[PDB]
Design a protein around this ligand. Structure first.
Ligand code: AMP
Ligand code: AMP
Ligand code: MG
Ligand code: MG
Ligand code: MG
Ligand code: MG
Lengths: 381, 380
């Protein structure tokens, strides 16, 4: 299933032949290819190789990105993670994760799962310069692709008025995955003009009230929240605004069914702990309770009306800008590999020569469950 | 270990020796005993033997109750289930399920899981007369125990002002589990004075607007909803009020963690389909949106404040009335068998000689998760 060439590299990475066989049989490791370049993708985690790790050769190993842990109680979350020591506070940008690296003569962009994204790879030079990889060919640029025209999200930061942007939040070494310290990363980002997430500054537990005021500002500005990082990047914790949790529910409630397990429950929990920590009461509490009920029910009810009055499926419409028409068809093929039911709904050439592609994603399973329930199907749950 | 005696009975009931072996090893069948009477309880379902079935001998087989299917869209649910044929509409009473049968010379009361309830068995003669079992010893009375003083619930019907009551909703035959037709069941209930669920009457799809008006009344009266049954009892479907769905969320939100999967999503789903079917909009919709947000967050936030300001566990307090003090201690032992962390919090003798027992149930797992999150524990 996977070649002895790749298996040899895994053994060098300290992975035992027995586990290598188990991963091969279970499909935890799979061979893939982009523009003729063969690589191994880790669908599942294995020892020092996190999920999303990709292996092109002995040197070109791009470690998967670590899962960032979140706190729901900010003050006590800071104390447990950092005590009273300083930490950097960066904006948590609502987009999708990418790792950018130079493999051979090519600049490849990998999504969380380890797939080469045809959209972001085609357009990476619109967001960053390749000078960095001339001097640091063994380093991986880690950032968030976010904007109103995204292939993977229907929301984004408010200050991005069109298209999509790259926001660097880490620089990691190949093979080791070692993250550069924050100061060194920011120095490199400035030196090479790599766009960065906003760094609000250096904080500590003693400034918790300023951090609460920051969260309140970000909430009013419709931004997702913050990621707190020790200067050596060894301790990282995220915290999301009530807006992020509420808007997340609103977007998901249009589909409701067949979403990741606990999707809505997790956001309700984060709202409750925010209301408790900040001791929100009275009318301000009622606004949050009304807002929560609205985003849970209104999009859900509207979709029920949609599936009741016609045979159309629940859908999301989103647009991206590509340089070449052929890239849009590459994206459709890629969406299918990701098991996403997406087709091209509309096309228009922009005044700058770019193609604005409007994709339509449908949700047949959620549509089927919703329509069955509307038509009186009886269930024990 | 289950005896060859019970294995033999299961064998005649059509279970293969292999399946019996898997059930014994996995624990799907387990031996139990009440006041010296040994029986087999089906912790898991097996072919024609549903979960909660109990087997005392070849004849005294009390079949587990079928899971009742619900509809979330009333009009289309009726059409799919009954088309335009008539069906009885009974009140769905919010309590706990019991099966009452005569085994030997004893009247035993079994809960859904197949346990003999020491509480309900002690007081069964307070709720029903035993004349029925003199004439129909092979029949099983199926009903709901509901009231403000319940061992298993903290909510109940509004018209029960104290203690607890039995509400008959089925009469089933031993071994076969066959349900008597609705008319025959109601005739027996009147004949023997067995208290019954309220039967609102015979309806059909053409009277959907009257049924909607019924739901609106039941909701305003804080009642759970309806169960629709074909006259031959072969087709049964339940439909729950928006009040019941909202109040269920309110009760669960105090604990939030470690509850049955989808508990809150199912109730939100039922609310949304009610708002869609009834075309509710404007202020009426906003009232429901506000109520949903309130019952999700207010009890949750209040419990967070509880676990933040002290080392106490999330708890529920509930009361029952028993005849003898020893029954309260039997209930504690039974509660532990059910893996429920309950102890006696308060006792008081009532003017009628009954003991009012106040039980306290704590939720250590939910308390630990809630407090950890409050104290800044970080998770993916
Ligand atoms: N400043 C940042 N540092 C780290 N991750 C970020 C940052 N901004 C956005 N993210 C993204 O947010 C994710 C954290 O989990 P979730 O919450 O979005 C990471 O996987 C990143 O893709
Ligand atoms: N009239 C009724 N007919 C059948 N079941 C009822 C009735 N009233 C209450 N119930 C209870 O409601 C359950 C239906 O599932 P759930 O909703 O509680 C049954 O298991 C009964 O215990
Ligand atoms: Mg994100
Ligand atoms: Mg979001
Ligand atoms: Mg019930
Ligand atoms: Mg209830």
């Amino acid at each position: 299933m996977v070649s002895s060439y790749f298996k040899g590299i895994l053994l060098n990475l300290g992975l035992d032949e027995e586990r290598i066989e188990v991963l091969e049989n279970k499909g935890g490791i799979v061979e893939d290819e982009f523009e003729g370049m063969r690589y191994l993708r880790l669908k599942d985690s294995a020892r020092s190789l996190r999920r999303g790790t990709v292996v092109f050769d002995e040197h070109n190993i791009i470690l998967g990105f670590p899962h960032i842990k979140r706190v729901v109680q900010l003050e006590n979350g800071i104390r447990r993670a950092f005590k009273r020591k300083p930490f950097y506070v960066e904006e948590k940008v609502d987009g999708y994760n990418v790792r950018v690296a130079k493999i051979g003569e090519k600049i490849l962009v990998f999504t969380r799962g380890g797939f080469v994204c045809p959209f972001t790879t085609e357009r990476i030079e619109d967001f960053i310069t390749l000078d960095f990889f001339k001097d640091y060919p063994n380093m991986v640029l880690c950032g968030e692709m976010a904007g109103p025209e995204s292939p993977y999200l229907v929301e984004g930061p408010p200050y991005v008025k069109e298209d999509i942007q790259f926001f660097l939040f880490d620089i990691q070494e190949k093979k080791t995955g070692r993250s550069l310290p924050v100061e060194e990363r920011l120095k490199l980002a400035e030196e090479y003009g790599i766009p960065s997430v906003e760094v609000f500054g250096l904080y500590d537990l003693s400034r918790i009230d300023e951090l609460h005021a920051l969260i309140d500002r970000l909430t009013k500005e419709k931004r997702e929240g913050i990621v707190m990082k020790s200067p050596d990047m060894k301790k990282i914790v995220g915290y999301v605004t009530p807006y992020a949790n509420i808007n997340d529910i609103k977007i998901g409630a249009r589909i409701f069914f067949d979403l990741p397990h606990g999707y809505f429950m997790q956001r309700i929990k984060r709202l409750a702990f925010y209301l408790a920590e900040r001791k929100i009461r009275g009318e301000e509490f009622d606004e949050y309770a009304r807002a929560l009920g609205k985003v849970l029910l209104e999009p859900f009810v509207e979709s029920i009306w949609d599936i009741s009055s016609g045979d159309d499926e629940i859908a999301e419409l989103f647009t991206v800008r590509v340089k070449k028409l052929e890239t849009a068809h590459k994206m459709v093929t890629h969406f299918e590999r990701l098991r996403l039911k997406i087709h091209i709904d509309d096309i228009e050439v922009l005044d700058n020569g770019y193609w604005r592609i409007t994709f339509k994603r449908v949700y047949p399973d959620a549509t089927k469950e919703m329509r069955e329930l509307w038509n009186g199907h009886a269930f024990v749950d």
